[PDB]
């Protein structure tokens, strides 16, 4: 089914939505086992690792990327001809962290000028519909019920912020992450296996430092309009203007 | 770089004519190069299209990267820049270009949408952010409507209401470029002029009735995460389909 | 009530000419009542039951409702008479600047407008009811800067000696009206009139409407020291340096 | 004045708690003055409004014009400023304040989903909020049972209406009592100022404890806004001034 009125209200106002129990106990086990099989095929990765391009690596994840349980809520917040921009898995262990990234008005130095909009996450609303160009559906494969489990955390209302947060911090001499220091509007989200966290990538977000033992697991699928390119990092515009990909604005990794 | 006045004009009108950007010798050399390149039939009568001019010619590969085009474009896109298309158009007697673009035109998916995020533009802290702009380099004089003059609906780049759906539903058969419309206006240009265009603007050209060849080369720019321009009919079943699905355009019903 | 096309036009241009709203009979009544008040005619409603009825006429109210879409009140009602060599320099504009004495601002919330779910929300609109034909520039035609009602950069601060109304501007356009036409106007629009050089009286009545929480129009020079000041501090206008 | 982080926070959450604005002495005199107004009638303190504090008391007339209120207010309104509202509030046991405000709540005139008295924007480094309120707390509120200020997250920039669907479906209980996933509580110390974008959908929890809870509220807006006055609808002759609220919980709870 489609997103209810209350769910749209929440995604609009908070920049994300947890849809509980989307995938059952059995499907979740099947997703975990498929990641274990990928470890067997190509051994020798670090224990904290990324699983790039899952739909190509596994027909199980190719189906999950097109599963209507993801696509229907995704269509409801994107409302454009839809394209799969990326699909990857994340395995994390003790002492891993993910610093804050995203945020609506963070700065980027554009050679001869500095800009405070990123049109890959700049979203709007029109005649009863959200239009968010880059959203992500995070399918959790393990329970994350405490901050020391490495819980997803986010800065309240940062998906619609008009002021930059991180440039001031970098030029101030800061060298620690807000996910460690704390911030008056930084909040945690707890989830179960099989939950989907539907995310406006405009939202400034990250995770806490994982302190507990055990493998923290998810699969992430990014979607946007058919005219966006598949996700690829790009350090800068290239001189012949044929460079393609995504140039991040200020993120905590730049100075933490 | 664009002046304050020029920025104001582009923001308020959706476009800017920059007069005499290229000299008469540079124009002639662009014209000469167009005389020997291959064209395709684009589907409009009495129109030839030069597809992918930067690929087919070193002359236009450089023009596409010429700072006389890039500096104004950068000032209205203000994102890491990518070249999305470069093409030429040649037109004779009795050719026409019906209205396309427009900020709030509808697209049916099941659901009906009235935003096209490929042309949805904004403003923030002293800068314009338009994701799809075109630099139109005119290689011929267009001084009267009967020359097939560029025309546009005023303020259509920031319109909040759809214009063309109602027209198709009420049985309209003819294009506003022929009919007329109280806010449809003409732009006249000289050879060597650049027209910098916000693609959210609803625009086209009058029907050309004069002899001679109407000539221009168009270069489209957008952010680095935009795909190179290619029409797409609809999203594909495996969601791997790449391209631009247009909204209502007069060609759908005129 | 406005048609869909009419709303598109009001949205995209910042104004709308509705032709022949009032018949020649009613226009003559309005002209006579203005002769009797003998330049600007303040508070026409409180001075005349004719204009008090006009301010509430539904040929004015219904299009006004379609662009304010808030609980309404009448904020001002005045008449204007002009002869030759009279001129109205440019005022209005979405992003014109104002100094508050410790900072400079580029928004005027009295005219800052928006759109939501099929409806326009313009906090200040004027219905200008014309009582004389204005068919050429030298008649003192209404003129406006295209798209200025949605402008994001200021225009008049940078150039601040002559008025754009005289020298010209690439997007300054003219509007022609017949007697009995209504010019419905978004006050965010930067506008004025050409210099009148012709003979004969130029006559109109203007009614401004806004939300019930807006105060009646009076020009305030600045915020008072006790924060009890009531009224409208205008932003950069041409007559500040012309 | 407001720091950059403070401006960021006001923008993103619709409010800002500025701690320790007023000292213990000042708070006592404010409290003292509200009790002086209580003395007009015999009997115990009752949940009530104290209208027009600036006119009622020289102390509160000065409070309304104090720079510790105006400087932050100015940083979020950025217009020629006008005092729109000045009142005191006493809350006792069993008192409650249901959700009101909200950026896209509906109003039947046709049905409209914008209230231009709270419709705020941003332009070239500055916030523009037409109606903001400085709440000066005269009591500690450190738990929900004390009747803590509560707000629906991000509701100052909501594009969807929340309350119309609840009313039309027969709901008769306030979110404040039932809870809501994005309804959160704000705790304050005596002397704290809560600076508030009135676009925010907010209220307080039901106060379940004894003791009394006091505050003084000052509302500000541009000079072309009228002083606050409830309006039910537009008057017959379009001459009436006032504020017509959109859907609030009081309408149906
Ligand atoms: O691990 C998470 O919970 C979020 C991960 C994330 O935001 C990302 O992969 O970009
Ligand atoms: O021919 C012109 O003048 C404009 C052409 C155009 O707008 C287009 O190629 O889409
Ligand atoms: O004279 C006109 O046509 C318009 C006058 C005007 O804009 C005004 O009265 O504020
Ligand atoms: O009592 C409170 O904490 C809030 C009161 C309030 O929102 C109001 O008076 O408008
Ligand atoms: Cs189409
Ligand atoms: Cs002034
Ligand atoms: Cs009400
Ligand atoms: Ni992320
Ligand atoms: Ni075109
Ligand atoms: Ni005017
Ligand atoms: Ni309140």
């Amino acid at each position: 089914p489609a997103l209810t009125r209350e769910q749209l209200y929440i995604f609009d106002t908070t920049g994300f939505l947890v849809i509980p129990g989307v995938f059952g106990s059995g499907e979740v086990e099947s997703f975990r086992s498929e990641l274990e099989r990928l470890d067997t095929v190509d051994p020798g990765f670090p224990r904290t690792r990324r699983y790039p391009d899952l739909p190509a690596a596994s027909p199980v994840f190719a189906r999950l990327a097109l599963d209507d349980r993801l696509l229907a809520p995704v269509r409801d917040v994107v409302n454009q001809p839809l394209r799969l921009l990326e699909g990857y898995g994340l395995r994390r262990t003790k002492d891993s962290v993910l610093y804050l990234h995203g945020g609506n008005s963070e700065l980027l130095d554009l050679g001869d000028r500095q800009v405070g909009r990123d049109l890959s996450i700049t979203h709007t609303y029109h005649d009863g519909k959200l239009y968010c160009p880059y959203v992500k559906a995070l399918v959790y494969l393990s329970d994350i019920q405490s901050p020391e489990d490495g819980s997803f955390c986010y800065v309240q209302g940062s998906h619609k912020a008009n002021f930059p947060l991180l440039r001031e911090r970098a030029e101030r001499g800061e060298n620690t992450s807000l996910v460690d220091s704390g911030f008056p509007t930084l909040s945690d989200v707890f989830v179960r296996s099989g939950d989907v966290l539907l995310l406006n990538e405009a939202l400034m977000h990250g995770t806490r430092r994982k302190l507990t033992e055990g493998d923290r697991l998810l699969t992430a699928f990014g979607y946007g309009p058919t005219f966006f390119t598949e996700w690829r990092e790009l350090d800068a515009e290239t001189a012949d203007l044929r460079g393609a990909g995504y140039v991040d604005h200020d993120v905590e990794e730049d100075f933490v």
Side-chain angles (χ1 to χ4, degrees), chain A:
Chain A
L3 291 176
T4 66
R5 299 288 293 171
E6 182 173 296
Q7 284 176 309
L8 292 169
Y9 180 95
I10 289 174
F11 184 90
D12 174 44
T13 57
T14 75
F16 74 100
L17 180 71
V18 169
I19 315 163
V22 180
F23 302 96
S25 156
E27 296 173 300
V28 165
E29 164 145 19
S30 155
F31 296 149
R32 297 173 115 129
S33 298
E34 180 61 16
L35 288 175
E36 295 173 11
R37 187 190 71 83
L38 287 177
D39 287 326
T40 298
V41 169
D42 303 317
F45 274 74
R47 210 43 193 143
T48 289
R49 64 161 296 180
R50 181 187 197 83
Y51 299 80
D53 201 347
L54 274 182
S58 157
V60 179
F61 289 126
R63 286 196 298 282
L64 181 64
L66 308 178
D67 193 301
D68 260 310
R69 285 172 291 179
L70 295 189
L71 294 191
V74 159
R75 286 192 169 98
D76 266 336
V77 298
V78 169
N79 287 294
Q80 302 276 281
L82 210 57
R83 167 178 208 185
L84 180 62
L85 263 19
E86 59 184 329
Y88 61 88
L90 294 176
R91 174 187 309 287
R92 277 179 49 199
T93 55
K94 191 183 59 173
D95 301 324
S96 65
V97 62
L98 185 61
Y99 297 140
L100 293 185
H101 53 289
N104 191 49
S105 298
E106 296 311 305
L107 306 174
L108 166 58
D109 291 325
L110 213 64
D112 53 333
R113 70 196 74 193
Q114 135 196 306
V115 295
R117 286 275 171 274
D118 186 345
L119 298 188
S120 64
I121 58 166
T122 301
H123 52 99
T124 186
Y125 166 94
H126 182 71
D127 285 4
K129 286 170 169 299
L130 298 172
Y131 296 90
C132 306
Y134 208 122
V135 307
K136 197 169 282 188
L138 308 175
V139 184
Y140 287 91
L141 307 181
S142 49
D143 303 311
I144 307 172
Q145 291 289 310
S146 84
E148 57 274 354
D149 271 346
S151 61
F152 179 98
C153 58
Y154 67 101
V155 179
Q156 291 176 30
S158 61
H159 61 311
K160 297 176 185 185
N162 292 286
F163 297 110
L165 188 61
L166 299 180
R167 187 51 66 94
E168 270 277 331
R169 301 192 49 89
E171 292 178 340
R172 180 197 278 133
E174 305 284 3
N175 70 344
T176 83
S177 167
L178 294 183
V179 309
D180 296 312
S181 300
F183 190 79
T185 57
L186 184 78
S187 317
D188 293 294
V189 180
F190 300 137
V191 299
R192 315 262 326 254
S193 288
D195 290 7
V196 170
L197 195 171
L198 183 64
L199 184 56
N200 185 341
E201 282 291 300
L203 187 77
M204 183 172 298
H205 66 286
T207 88
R208 305 298 185 169
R209 194 167 300 265
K210 182 184 205 301
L211 296 189
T212 67
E213 282 268 325
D215 280 12
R216 175 196 197 277
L217 284 161
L218 64 62
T219 49
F221 304 86
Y223 305 86
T226 58
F227 47 85
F228 275 25
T229 62
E230 301 191 337
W231 181 79
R232 187 182 173 190
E233 200 212 355
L234 179 63
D235 284 347
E237 146 189 341
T238 68
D240 67 347
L241 307 186
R242 260 66 156 202
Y246 294 71
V247 181
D248 278 358
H249 293 209
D250 287 351
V251 297
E252 272 182 332
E253 280 184 19
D254 295 331
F255 57 93
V256 175

